[PDB]
Amino acid sequence: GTKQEKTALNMARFIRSQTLTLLEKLNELGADEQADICESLHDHADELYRSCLARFGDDGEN
Amino acid sequence: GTKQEKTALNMARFIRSQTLTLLEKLNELGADEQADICESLHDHADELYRSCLARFGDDGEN
Numbered sequence: 001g002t003k004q005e006k007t008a009l010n011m012a013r014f015i016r017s018q019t020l021t022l023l024e025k026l027n028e029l030g031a032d033e034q035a036d037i038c039e040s041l042h043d044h045a046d047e048l049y050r051s052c053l054a055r056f057g058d059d060g061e062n
Numbered sequence: 063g064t065k066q067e068k069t070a071l072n073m074a075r076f077i078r079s080q081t082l083t084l085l086e087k088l089n090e091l092g093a094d095e096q097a098d099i100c101e102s103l104h105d106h107a108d109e110l111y112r113s114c115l116a117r118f119g120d121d122g123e124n
Contacts, residue, residue, distance in 0.1 A: 037106075044102070
């Protein structure tokens with residue numbers, strides 16, 4: 001239901017946030033290859049968030 | 063340092079887990095397009111975990 005929809009949208013938003021924070025940590029670590037993959041992962045997570053936002057977002061959202 | 067390395071490895075592992083759980087929720091929701099993107103996102107997060115594991119993993123790990 002909507003309880004599950006909002007939960008999934010929140011998860012997508014959370015994952016997007018976590019990938020951003022990990023990207024920061026990998027750059028601070030000078031973790032080359034890791035950061036490249038994490039940067040691309042973050043873009044991908046943003047693509048999923050935009051998808052979940054459009055479908056599970058309300059009137060003013062989506 | 064190693065405190066930051068382990069933190070980043072844990073984050074990668076966590077994100078991998080979160081994407082798996084989100085994938086489950088999206089499938090339960092019948093969220094077609096979302097699940098396809100999340101499945102691909104999970105594979106991507108696994109690629110990042112394997113990368114962080116090799117670099118930040120100890121002797122028995124990595």
